[PDB]
Amino acid sequence: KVQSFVDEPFLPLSGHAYMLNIFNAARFAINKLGNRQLYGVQHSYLYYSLGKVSKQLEGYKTARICYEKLASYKIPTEWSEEIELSTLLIRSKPYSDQESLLPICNRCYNQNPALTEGNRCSSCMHQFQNCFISFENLPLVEFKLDPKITHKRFIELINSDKSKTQPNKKKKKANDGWQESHQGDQQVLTFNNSPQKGGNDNESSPFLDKLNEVFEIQQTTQEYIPVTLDENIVSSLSIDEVYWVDYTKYCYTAEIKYYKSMLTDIPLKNCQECGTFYILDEYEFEISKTQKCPFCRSVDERAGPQKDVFDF
Amino acid sequence: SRNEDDDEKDKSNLEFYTFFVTSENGIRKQDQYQLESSIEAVFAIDIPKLYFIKRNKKTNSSGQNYKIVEKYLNDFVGLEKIDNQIKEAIMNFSFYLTMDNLDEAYKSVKQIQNPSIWEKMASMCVKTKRIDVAEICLGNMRFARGSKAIREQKKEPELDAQLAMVAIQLNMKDEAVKLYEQSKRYDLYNKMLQAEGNWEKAIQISENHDRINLKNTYYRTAQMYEVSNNYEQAILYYEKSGTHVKEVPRMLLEAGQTEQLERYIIDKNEKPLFKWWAQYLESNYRIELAVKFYRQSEDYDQMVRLFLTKNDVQTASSICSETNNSAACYILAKYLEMNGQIPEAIQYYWKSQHYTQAVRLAREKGMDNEVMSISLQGPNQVKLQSAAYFEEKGFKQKAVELYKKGGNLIKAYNLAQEEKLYDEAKQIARQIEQEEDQRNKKRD
Amino acid sequence: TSRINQIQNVSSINLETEPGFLSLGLYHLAAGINNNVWYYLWLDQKRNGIIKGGEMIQKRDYLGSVKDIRLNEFWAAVLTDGKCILHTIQPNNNVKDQKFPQIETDKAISGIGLTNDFLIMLDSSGKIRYYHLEDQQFVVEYKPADCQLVKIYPNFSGTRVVCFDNKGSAYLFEPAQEQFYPLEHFPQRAEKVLWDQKDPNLFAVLQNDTLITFIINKNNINGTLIQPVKELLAIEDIKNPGPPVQTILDRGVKPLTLSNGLLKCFTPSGSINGQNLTSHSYLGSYKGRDDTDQGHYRFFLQNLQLHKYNNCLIAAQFLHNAVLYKELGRKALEFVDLDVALKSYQLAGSLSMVMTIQSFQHINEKNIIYGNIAMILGQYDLAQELFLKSSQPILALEMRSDIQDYLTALNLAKSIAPQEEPFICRRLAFQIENQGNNQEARKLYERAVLNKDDRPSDRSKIDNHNQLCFAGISRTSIKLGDIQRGVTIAKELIDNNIVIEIAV
Ligand SMILES: [Zn+2]
Ligand SMILES: [Zn+2]
């Protein structure tokens, strides 16, 4: 993606969405790769594109960091004078970035810099997620299931729990948590130079209480241990938000990962053949444009069984 | 084709064989020499030199003369530089290598050591197909490049490939070619042939043997032609290569032949070429020609973008009404978001199959019929979100209906007990028993 | 003067006073006499097209004299004996004067320089300051700047600057790196320096009677190279410093500027001569159709001096001599020109060269390539130092083990990556059975065995090393008379050929 951007000469007045997508792709690639110097990449195009897109989109801290990195790099003489001139020009610009662009880490509620080692935040040790079409951060968190609980009956039990947790007004935990969130609300914001701490704990739910207790435990231990959930929280959950990834078609029993979306308003679509996440807007637009899954390189579900003997 | 007749003029029917004879190992073959047709007879044998009789046909006299020809042994070819004490060490090492007596030969070579002697060591080790002594010698060259080649080549199941690589490192291409043919390996030989310079021979070998790396060979030949400044040959081998849509414009702009690029794009008549040329025209402030080439490339998003740059919304509206492109409508609605044209923006978002944005905007602005019409044709998630919003609204009956038409029917059943209706409740009961039977009929 | 060998139509501007200072901008024209300044404009900004006559926009008067006038496109700088001021040429409706530069010292600015967007001011105290036009801020400050500053000359964009200082000294300054660079072989009475619009690397210095040309090189291995280009007629015989090339200039003529290897020489009767420097002059003289061999060798020599490696490559391919091919390949390799070096070496007839060249073209990292080029071409210690300076010292350890020095390799391995101690130690074992020191082999092999037995992970390599070390102890114990242990450990080991060799 970034090479298809860079080889094309840039438009002086280009679309803001295209620039944002290119910046996100470059930042994600730089964060994920870092220093492995694998076969295929040159580590110069990414930095140059990130610098140009940041200069066009403020991003003063990232621009300075990538410009220093490129100064440590060697480039063809066509770009050196432009790079030094842009660096000296940006020297006069204010620091502290521009906000409203740094990714928001879930289970932390804190703001982190765009370039943070192997695509993880400083507050916790949790892997980020991105929609491959737009390379935009997704509001998703990872959780595990007890070995005693089996997934097949887990599905039916959580379905029954979601179904029962609506009409019966006797006792339910979901509506209790919703009402507690509506009644009591704590929202604090603190400003710093690079970071921002968001104290948003209005939603008092058993899941979030267990999450914050586990986060304090991990801070005490200074290590990462994935959260393990018991039957009560599992019953307290619903059906639409879960986005479990299965590798059963390749291996009948290898592993299974479970993810929860904090924001239920945003819809996410998970291709199980390639096990990749997408935003329904971009995924639907791409499917309408072409009937092939981009990373999966497989047929679309809406179409018929194209897999016949002739194609085989 | 004719590879056995013309070579017999200089080849004779006499071959020389060298042997070391002892009681322990009996007789062992050491080396073989092919005598040319000019060589008439074997004169004698000496340690540093071998002497033969050669005819003198060029003499005009009736009686042709005969001269002595002095030649070096295979292990002594090249070493012109003081041969007084080395012969003993070389003979001892070869003799001990005949029986593979490693340590005796190593301790015999210990006392002298010399880089030229070490390269002769490595050459004869390659000749005798021994690897450990060969890599030890390559360690003793202080030849870091050969060691790096060893390290990068050792990751190969075939030892013959490593031997051929060492032959390349020691500069005899014929032995490496023979080894590659012996091992039935052609890709490494194809790479070597591509490197050395005979590109056409490499192309022929690839097409008759591999045919897989043929595209790579074409690309490499095109790159070589580009280095040779042969623009026509470079572009030709680009179209015979796998990719030519992007390499040709890049080389043309590197050279600066704008008119040649124009001739090429007019001859090709391809949409990506039109898009590239229009983008370049817009970059160099040729707006009208860029618009014309965009029209020839059918990129309506670009016309909407350009007309939005100059705030010429009327022509953009006409274009989106005529072509009815989806992304053009999407970007037009994006502009209308800033332009304060919410109804038309929502309509265009609905047309562009972007459901959630339009339905969420209308839910904030309070439109009822449009959002349910959108959700009826939308996916399950949009249906759920819109009908939950309708639950949040003052009228819940329509939310019940949209659940009934939505993907969640147990929710409709539970609402049926909640609102304690009977007719719609019994219809929902019929629907839920239908879905239960549908699920039970799949597999049991 | 856009075109070559001909002069376009001149345009007349009317005046009634005779100024002693003249300044030219992209659009305006400034005429300055003592305490009087005149400004002229063409059309009204945008694109000229048709050009109108001289328009008197604003007559400017000063309390002091006008020492110097500068005008880039949009702002104008006026110098008086003690103070510099700024002005806007297009607008006169604005009643707010420009922010006056300088500080409480209020001393005369020794050096002033206008670029497209930046203003450089250098004071008599020896301090250079960078000023942003639209922001009006001091972005870059450098107070020490060696001993004392006399004269300054910036690039047309401000990327480079050259400072002439007391006792006839010269220095090069880069705002990005904020570090000075001393200069050598410079005349002490040169008055001006002209940059080249074609390439920022090349520039020229005007002595009172001679022209000197200099080039900045950053692609040179482990060095930023600045040197006066020499003249040489030897057939690759000598590569040593010599007299610099000097262009003979006529008496009382001032070249206006140098661009594309062409100098705008001005001579009386209003004559403009493009001429050429006597380094690119023979470059333009050579045609390459038939010519001769001495001329072709001179063309190759001057291309090598000017680093025109494409002309060097064509001059090489004309003459099939192998030594010239080797020299050109070595020079291109030393100037990190990978493609030219590969082509020259392939034309020479070597494959081991091109294998490593193609392997090197893969890596785009900086220190890794610098060290690899050093270790292929010349010395090895500098390559090791470069690799240590890089982020992959394991390559340096491998290179040191490759030379088998084993005096610095072991120390480096212990210093950086002590987890590879066993394998390298095994190599020492071979060396310690090469020198005949049988006893030391026992302890070296035993230490290696203990080290590899400590780590149980990845049992394949551990088992291979164990078998090899067991063979080593078996052979060294047999050689030392320890028959029982050697024959026993030969019994447990299973690899047949090694046991056969030990029995032999
Ligand atoms: Zn976190
Ligand atoms: Zn997929």
Numbering used by the authors:
A (entry chain A): 940 to 1251
B (entry chain D): 641 to 1084
C (entry chain E): 380 to 883
What text does the study give?
Intraflagellar transport (IFT) trains, the polymers composed of two multi-subunit complexes, IFT-A and IFT-B, carry out bidirectional intracellular transport in cilia, vital for cilia biogenesis and signaling. The IFT-A complex is composed of six subunits (IFT144, IFT140, IFT122, IFT121, IFT139 and IFT43), mediating both the retrograde trafficking (toward the base) driven by the dynein-1b and the ciliary import of various membrane proteins across the ciliary gate. Here, we purified the IFT-A complex from protozoa Tetrahymena thermophila and determined the cryo-EM structures of the IFT-A complex and its subassemblies at a resolution range of 3.6 to 8.8 Å. Analysis of these structures reveal that the apo IFT-A complex is composed of two rigid structural modules, the head and base modules, and presents two distinct–elongated and folded states in solutions, the latter of which was not identified in recent IFT-A structural studies.
In particular, IFT144, IFT140, IFT122 and IFT121, share the same domain organization, from the N- to the C-termini encompassing two tandem WD40 β-propellers (WDs), an array of 12 to 20 TPRs and, except for IFT140, a zinc binding domain (ZBD). These four subunits are distributed into the two modules; the head module consists of IFT140, IFT144 and the C-terminal half of IFT122 (IFT122C, 706-1246), whereas the base module consists of IFT121, the N-terminus of IFT122 (IFT122N, 1-705) as well as IFT139 and IFT43. Intriguingly, the N-terminal WD40 propellers together with the first four TPRs of both IFT140 and IFT144 in the head module are organized by pseudo-two-fold symmetry, in which a unique α-helical insertion between the second and the third TPRs in IFT140 and IFT144 allows TPRs at the junction to lock into a zigzagged configuration in both shape and electrostatic complementary manners. In the head module, the ~15-residue linkers between the second WD40 propeller and the first TPR in both IFT140 and IFT144 make a sharp turn such that the propellers of IFT140 and IFT144 point to opposite directions away from the central pseudo-two-fold axis in an elongated conformation. The C-terminal ZBD of IFT122 attaches to the other side of the IFT140-IFT144 TPR junction to constitute a compact core that is further encircled by the TPR array of IFT140, burying a total of ~2500 Å2 solvent exposed surface area. From this core extend out the TPR arms of IFT122, IFT140 and IFT144, the most variable segments in the head module. A frameshift mutation at Tyr1077 in human IFT122ZBD (equivalent to Lys1013 in Tetramymena IFT122ZBD) that would disrupt the head module core causes the severe Beemer-Langer syndrome with early infant death or Cranioectodermal dysplasia, highlighting the essential role of IFT122ZBD in organizing the head module core in IFT-A. Structural comparison shows that individual head and base modules are almost identical in these two states.
